[PDB]
């Protein structure tokens, strides 16, 4: 068949709605596994999408630039899923600038920030977090953060400033490169069908 790795969360409905407008029926709709005649859906966490693709346990998945880069993932990413613009940023308390001592930074993306630090030739203590990362500065848990931003409300609420824009984020449909060649016909049909429905929504 064609095994998909769908990210739970903000995108879940979007992706699953695109799938439906495509002709897909499931007949096993469980909270975590939607198994269908010619398509199975692993409802996994976004960070894990890449894991599923690179071991070939899924053929197709949906990821943000952020998890792809955080995971050193190297796949095929033919087109996007429409999504409001977001950005990975470095940020700290307002009018404090980059502290020079040993820059303490919190993220959900230790990898991305561990690389960012190398590129700027810094020495930094990475405090890994799971969410509420914008607190770290306020609480004294870090001097800085690297986190996603869209509108910049959360940042202006917590009196944080964008000190730098690392990269901009977009949500990609992603394809394991071997099954793009092994199941080529299947993949290209489904991908055209998917892309036709995103297109209906002007």
């Amino acid at each position: 068949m064609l095994k998909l790795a769908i990210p739970k969360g903000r995108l879940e409905e979007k992706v699953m709605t695109y799938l439906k407008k495509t002709g897909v029926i499931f007949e096993r709709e469980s909270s975590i596994l939607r198994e269908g005649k010619d398509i199975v859906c692993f409802m996994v966490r976004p960070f894990d999408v890449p894991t599923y693709l690179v071991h070939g346990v899924a053929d197709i998945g949906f990821c943000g630039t952020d998890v792809l880069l955080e995971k050193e993932t190297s796949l095929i990413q033919p087109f996007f899923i429409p999504t409001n613009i977001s950005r990975m940023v470095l940020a700290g308390p307002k009018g404090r600038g980059i502290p020079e001592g040993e820059k303490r930074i919190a993220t959900k993306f230790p990898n991305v920030t561990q690389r960012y630090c190398e590129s700027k030739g810094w020495h930094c203590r990475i405090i890994p977090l799971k969410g509420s990362v914008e607190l770290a500065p306020i609480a004294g848990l870090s001097d800085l953060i690297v986190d996603i931003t869209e509108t910049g409300r959360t940042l202006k609420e917590n009196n944080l400033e964008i000190l730098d824009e690392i990269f901009v984020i977009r949500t990609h449909v992603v394809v394991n490169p071997v099954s793009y060649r092994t199941k080529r016909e299947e993949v290209v049909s489904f991908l055209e069908k998917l892309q036709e429905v995103i297109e209906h929504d002007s």
Partner: protein
Amino acid sequence: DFLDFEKVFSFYSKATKKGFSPFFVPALEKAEEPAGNFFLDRKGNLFSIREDFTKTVLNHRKRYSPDSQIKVWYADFVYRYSGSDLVAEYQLGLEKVPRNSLDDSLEVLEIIVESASEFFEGPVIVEIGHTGVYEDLLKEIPKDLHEKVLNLIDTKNLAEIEFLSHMKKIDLSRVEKIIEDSIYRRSPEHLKTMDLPLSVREDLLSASSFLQEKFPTVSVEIDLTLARTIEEYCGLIFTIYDTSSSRLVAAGGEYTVNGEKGVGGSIFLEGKTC
């Protein structure tokens, strides 16, 4: 179930009938100085592990007397990391240095494809590329940005190529064409319609032809998007996939390390979902 390892004697036969001598070295190799992944021991020895067979072969060429022609085959474990885990996978491979012509590389392809074809059941696909493109592509594109397009080509991100096309105001139509052709026009006959330097066409024509004539039952496909292989290879590039097991079964190409040319290939008994 180690038993797959019998295909080695079959491989050994193919390669010796074609002048390939057996090449066998220890997995660890003493290193003058630390160079990436290394192991040290309690006796003050620093070692590197076999991570790349063709690097290992070229490095043993430097030990030997001036010049040294080399036509060898190997069969052994190649070690690699995934995250911080040491992982091994058995490989059967070939190496020839210099490639005096194209026939050398074609002899290499013949032996590796003939092997894959026997060792795996279920439609086999021979994907052929060529490093010599890219340089053609980029030189109507602004110098800064080269890193980007090359990336987007490797990822087949047509979408963002159309976006740079519009937001930076450069026509990237042939870039879009290579990507597109890697999906819809993989048959060798579409080389005719592709814009490429004479010698890239030629190499591609004679590799696609040679493989087609010899192997009626393998699908010979063209794909010039593998841009990451730009700075490990220089010339013809190939990859074999096994449909039945849906995995990457072989890879190789032409290369040029510090003057003078070589070709090599490798087969992975199983391995490679990626």
